[PDB]
Amino acid sequence: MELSVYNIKGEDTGKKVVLDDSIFAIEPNDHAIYLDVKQYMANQRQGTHKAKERSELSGSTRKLIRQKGSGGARRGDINSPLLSGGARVFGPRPRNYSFKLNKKLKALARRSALSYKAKNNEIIVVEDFNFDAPKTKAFKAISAALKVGEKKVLYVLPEVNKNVYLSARNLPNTNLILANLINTYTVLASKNLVLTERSVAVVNELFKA
Amino acid sequence: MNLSSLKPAEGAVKSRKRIGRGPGSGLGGTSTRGHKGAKSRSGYSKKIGFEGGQMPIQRRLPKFGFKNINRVEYKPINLSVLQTLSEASVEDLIAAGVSRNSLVKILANGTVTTALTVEAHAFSKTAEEAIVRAGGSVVKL
Amino acid sequence: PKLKTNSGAKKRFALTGTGKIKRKHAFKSHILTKKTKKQKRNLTYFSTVHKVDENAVKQLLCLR
Amino acid sequence: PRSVNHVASRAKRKRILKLTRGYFGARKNVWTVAKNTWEKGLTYAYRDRKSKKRNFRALWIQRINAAARLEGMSYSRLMGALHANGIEINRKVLADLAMNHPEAFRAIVAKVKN
RNA sequence: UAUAUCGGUAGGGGAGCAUUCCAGCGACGUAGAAGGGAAAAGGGCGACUUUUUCUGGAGUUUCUGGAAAAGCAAA
RNA sequence: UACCGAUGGAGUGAGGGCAUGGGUGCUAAGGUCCAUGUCCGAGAGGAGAAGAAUCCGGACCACCGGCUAAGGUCCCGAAA
RNA sequence: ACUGGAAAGUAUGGCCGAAGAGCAUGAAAGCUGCGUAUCCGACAUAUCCCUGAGUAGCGCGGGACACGAAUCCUGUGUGAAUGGCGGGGCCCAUCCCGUAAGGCUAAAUACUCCCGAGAGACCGAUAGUGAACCAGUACCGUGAGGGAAAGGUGAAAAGAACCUCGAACAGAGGAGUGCAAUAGACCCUGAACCCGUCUGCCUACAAGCGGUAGGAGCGCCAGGUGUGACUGCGUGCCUUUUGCAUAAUGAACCUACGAGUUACUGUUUGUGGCAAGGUUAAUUGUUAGACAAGGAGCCGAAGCGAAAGCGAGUCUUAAAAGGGCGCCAGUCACGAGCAGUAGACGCGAAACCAAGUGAUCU
RNA sequence: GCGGGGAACUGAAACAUCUCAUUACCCGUAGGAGAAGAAAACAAGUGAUUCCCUCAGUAGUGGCGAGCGAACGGGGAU
RNA sequence: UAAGGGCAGACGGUGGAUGCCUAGGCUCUCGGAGGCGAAGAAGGACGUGAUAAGCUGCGAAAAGCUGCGGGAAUCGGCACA
Ligand SMILES: [K+]
Ligand SMILES: [K+]
Ligand SMILES: [K+]
Ligand SMILES: [K+]
Ligand SMILES: [K+]
Ligand SMILES: [K+]
Ligand SMILES: [K+]
Ligand SMILES: [K+]
Ligand SMILES: [K+]
Ligand SMILES: [Mg+2]
Ligand SMILES: [Mg+2]
Ligand SMILES: [Mg+2]
Ligand SMILES: [Mg+2]
Ligand SMILES: [Mg+2]
Ligand SMILES: [Mg+2]
Ligand SMILES: [Mg+2]
Ligand SMILES: [Mg+2]
Ligand SMILES: [Mg+2]
Ligand SMILES: [Mg+2]
Ligand SMILES: [Mg+2]
Ligand SMILES: [Mg+2]
Ligand SMILES: [Mg+2]
Ligand SMILES: [Mg+2]
Ligand SMILES: [Mg+2]
Ligand SMILES: [Mg+2]
Ligand SMILES: [Mg+2]
Ligand SMILES: [Mg+2]
Ligand SMILES: [Mg+2]
Ligand SMILES: [Mg+2]
Ligand SMILES: [Mg+2]
Ligand SMILES: [Mg+2]
Ligand SMILES: [Mg+2]
Ligand SMILES: [Mg+2]
Ligand SMILES: [Mg+2]
Ligand SMILES: [Mg+2]
Ligand SMILES: [Mg+2]
Ligand SMILES: [Mg+2]
Ligand SMILES: [Mg+2]
Ligand SMILES: [Mg+2]
Ligand SMILES: [Mg+2]
Ligand SMILES: [Mg+2]
Ligand SMILES: [Mg+2]
Ligand SMILES: [Mg+2]
Ligand SMILES: [Mg+2]
Ligand SMILES: [Mg+2]
Ligand SMILES: [Mg+2]
Ligand SMILES: [Mg+2]
Ligand SMILES: [Mg+2]
Ligand code: NA
Ligand code: NA
Ligand code: NA
Ligand code: NA
Ligand code: NA
């Protein structure tokens, strides 16, 4: 596809970039997007949860009552789950929730998300910019000029740009990401996607086909 | 779709079976186990190769044969795939485009019908006759 | 843990090309003057595992 | 996470116990006793929905028998005559006429009195 | 659209409801949240769900997907 | 109208009554062991006063409609 | 400005942002407080010719090695060589490799009583540690040892001056405080079982699981609601059984608690990605889980034969298709079912073994 | 961590070889780690130890039962 | 005529469920550190406050003594003085 380029003042610059068709104009795979999103949210998990089973309780293993003759239910030791304060049966155990997805499946899901953004027309290509000093107001003005300051936005940068990151840190509906670390969840989680020219070049080079 | 309207493919996810949770489910009470006996108890396990005390088949039958340690087994390659690789050269034995540092034996199932010099660890007599008839050569090394 | 093969089964059974189990007939080791020559040759030949004994032989060979 | 459905579990019992009001003693409010009583009642209700049709037909037949004997016939003779003449008025309507519209019942009887 | 079929134990198969928490999207709340009492209505059917009012005095919830310490009448 | 191949999941491997053909027993047993059907098991409804398998009959739900089965029609109790 | 007891709420209108983390504040605060981003800061005191002899080897009895008698070890008895000597799964010869009977050695590895800083699709007072509080306390036992229950007034004690009944706050009725005292000290909410009072209807000629289906009269508030004269039908439930109203088992009742879970490895299947190929593991780089690398390995791609081996053939045979087996789309995942190994659906023995405590009874 | 002693219930659908297990337990004794470590080695070319992924439930072992179970090689950390 | 009883509603009693709440647990991550003791340890006994000490701290100098650095208006530990 072809996208016009805006400066940081919100005005069309007359320059145009070409987005790779094999990235931005493919038929999206909804099942692939589902799988990639699920894997991302599973990898974020820290499954630190546990309860005490019978072998891990603190009571002694002594038979509480004699087997026959007392006239009540037969009883073993005090750690039984039938007793109040007894064992937790089949409670949680520490777990690792990561699983495997094929690399080609992940690439397909990434391209499906990008194609979906392009088809629904939320991709804005902007000129590369730098800040001499960190300043939240300047980044806010850039977002307002690009008309992305209402809903969630994701800016994609070609490199670190520490001053820009510091400027965008405090804004609540703004996310930043490097071009080479683009993933399906992050692309889909934001309403608007903003790319720079160098970011477009990097994405086209690195995620094609 | 976005994160708010995710949908798996139809029939991709299925709910698990949960037993011992009431009459309406069809899986409560005895919870699919039947009534009594060994198989109804917690911790029952099947003894593999056990038939109730009758001498099992894996003891009734006799042991046979032996396995050679230094068995030289070749990977078979046929004339049909030789000709397929030839039709996009005349000098085979590249074979990485397969194997991975293996011994290759050329066998005769299809037909070469070309003029190729093939290097391989082994050939069959039929394969040699076929390649020479089509006008080829062998390098058995 | 991974499944363990039964040692006796791995010494007594073998896989054929189309996923059949090869076995040897078992009545011929030490009482052979009394038996019949055709009987002995039919016990010499290599047989296959019956379908009802399959999946039990497979469980012994770790479903391989 | 830990899940205990306290409110739903209690609400199920409360909904059923609203249905056992009016029962005698512990059968109205004690829950295991009350729930036991309510299900046996449901089996009774299924059976009695079937029995109600037989009961009402028997009542209609008895009223028709009395009115026919007042007119000079018996129930079996009257119904045979009606069926022979092809009159399709059912026993519910005939009993209603016998109880409340004796002139109409009389004209019906006079139609087949031949 | 028709025809046929629809008693069920062991048992096999299918489709759903509620519960706790999470992500995304929407919402509600001192002009009264959750919980507790009473009343009314609803559902091919049901698990259950809405609404009104009193008490209560601070949190709760819809839809889509995800994960389980995910449902008691007898031991 | 659902019989075979191959595959995934089973449960069952304490049966019982009746009729028929028999063994055993005493041509006893609501006895016991086989065979052929059937029903209860796992089956509600109707008659038989009340009865697991005798006689009639296989319950998707509702109906204050109708016809019948076995068996009945003096009253309890529907119909001479 | 509005509501409110009280704004941090809602509606306006402003400002800061390298600070929109959080906690507290009379309800939910970027701009009220402590903080947060960022920058600055230490008088000390700490930290950074020779070549290994009771040997090598050997007998007997044993042990450890994956191995239940090669290599290694030795209780008992013996016992060399100095180019020589040892090993290559038992012994011999050749070949190859090494040089015992002396010693030291960082890293990559294992762990958490303790300290600092963090986190959770972990619990939330019968849960989570036995222990949120008086906790290894109370209590029990000669002793070793066993081992609990127990959180919540209110924003703020403003924790009720004073009056009345009464011997007394024993308790209550007031007044007053407070948004609220039916928040009054056992104090948020305040369910069930269980216990009462009032009002409506029924009930002292009546006989069985207590309901269910009909159905007057009476009583409340406009077709609803309470009761129920009288009539038909009806031997609870669970479990175990050929078969249970059974005089077979089981439960006083209520609330709360209580039982197919997870990991790994297989197998089948639903749905997917790539496809004659499919897939990475451990690990590494960048920035900080993501992205990229990493092809070792595994499966498929040719079978037959015990095997040498031959190959769309092959085995059997002197030879014959006479006979057997074969020729004539996979792989990696996600979800689910099932299996095995783990305590493996839960509760329950009589016992066995190890280390201790007891002769204050007898 | 190293060392000295060392069970049984259990599995084998009985049980004695075997298993449970060189586990529980008792005892002795270090350090921030300890042990190991520089070939009288593996193999049929590599080149000290240690740890991870494979090789592989393979070779073997076994009342050849139940079971037990390597190494060479290759890829890494160092 | 209801001695008493039955059912329903309302309102109370008991009891402490439920909802909401909590730094008290549980599982981990990263970085340190990995001992104390004859210069007398761990763990205790008895003391110590203006007023009895249940905890806490401390040791006949006994909820504390001295110096240096930091800080700037309250402080005299907790169990509603
Ligand atoms: K049951
Ligand atoms: K036997
Ligand atoms: K909640
Ligand atoms: K029989
Ligand atoms: K209050
Ligand atoms: K409050
Ligand atoms: K109350
Ligand atoms: K009644
Ligand atoms: K008894
Ligand atoms: Mg014990
Ligand atoms: Mg517990
Ligand atoms: Mg569970
Ligand atoms: Mg069933
Ligand atoms: Mg069974
Ligand atoms: Mg049972
Ligand atoms: Mg049985
Ligand atoms: Mg058990
Ligand atoms: Mg009828
Ligand atoms: Mg039917
Ligand atoms: Mg059915
Ligand atoms: Mg209100
Ligand atoms: Mg549960
Ligand atoms: Mg319950
Ligand atoms: Mg049997
Ligand atoms: Mg039998
Ligand atoms: Mg009999
Ligand atoms: Mg049965
Ligand atoms: Mg039947
Ligand atoms: Mg008729
Ligand atoms: Mg009559
Ligand atoms: Mg603030
Ligand atoms: Mg507790
Ligand atoms: Mg007094
Ligand atoms: Mg109140
Ligand atoms: Mg209260
Ligand atoms: Mg009388
Ligand atoms: Mg009377
Ligand atoms: Mg019996
Ligand atoms: Mg009966
Ligand atoms: Mg019994
Ligand atoms: Mg009893
Ligand atoms: Mg009973
Ligand atoms: Mg009960
Ligand atoms: Mg109970
Ligand atoms: Mg045994
Ligand atoms: Mg009364
Ligand atoms: Mg009450
Ligand atoms: Mg002194
Ligand atoms: Na099902
Ligand atoms: Na409040
Ligand atoms: Na007072
Ligand atoms: Na009892
Ligand atoms: Na009374």
Instruction: Collect all residues with Cβ–Cβ distance below 8 Å to A150 and sequence separation of at least 6.
Output: A173
Q: Specify whether the CB–CB gap between A177 and A156 falls below 8 A.
A: yes
Among positive and negative, which fits the CA dihedral B112, B116, B121, B126? positive
Please name which of D75, D83, D71 lies closest in space to residue D113, comparing C-alpha atoms. Answer: D71
What is the separation, in whole angstroms, between the first and last Cα of chain C? 17
In the chain, the amino acid numbered B12 is A
Strand C21-24, strand C46-48: pairing: antiparallel
Phi and psi angles of residue B24, each rounded to the nearest 5 degrees, phi first: -70, -25
Q: Rounded distance, CA B121 to CA B93, Å?
A: 10
Radius of gyration of chain C (CA): 14
Cβ of B61 within 8 Å of Cβ of C6? The answer is no
Question: How many angstroms is the resolution?
Answer: 2.7
Q: Do B48 and C6 touch (CB under 8 A)?
A: yes
Angle of CA points D7, D13, D16, to nearest 5°: 135
Cα atoms in the Cβ-side hemisphere of radius 13 Å centred on A109:
26
**Angle of the A103-120 helix axis to the A30-43 helix axis, nearest 10:** 110
What 3-state DSSP class applies to A187?
Answer: helix
Burial class (CB in 10 A: 0-12, 13-18, 19+), A23: buried
Return the amino acid letter for D81.
A
Q: CB neighbours of B40 closer than 8 A, spacing ≥ 6?
A: B30, B33, B34
Q: Identify the residue whose tokens are 């290509």.
A: A125
* Strand G nucleotides where any atom sits below 7 Å of a protein CB: 17-21, 119-124, 126-131, 136, 145-149, 192-194, 209-214, 226-228, 232-234, 236-237, 239-241, 253-267, 270-274, 277-281, 286-293, 296-297, 300-313, 324-327, 332-341, 343-350
Structural tokens at position B88: 């996009």
Q: What is the 3-state secondary structure (H, E, C) of B66-78?
A: CCCCCCCCCEEEE
Query: Is the Cβ–Cβ distance between A199 and A157 less than 8 Å?
Result: yes
The answer to whether residues A19 and A200 touch, using CB atoms and an 8 Å cutoff, is: yes
CA atoms within 13 A on the CB side of B44: 9
* The one-letter amino acid at D96: D
Beta bridge partners of A207: none
d(CA A6, CA A194): 11
Phi and psi for B39 in degrees, rounded to 5? -70, -15
Pairing of strands A192-196, A153-157: parallel
Pairing of β B137-140 and β A12-18 = unpaired
Q: How many CB pairs under 8 A join B and C?
A: 38
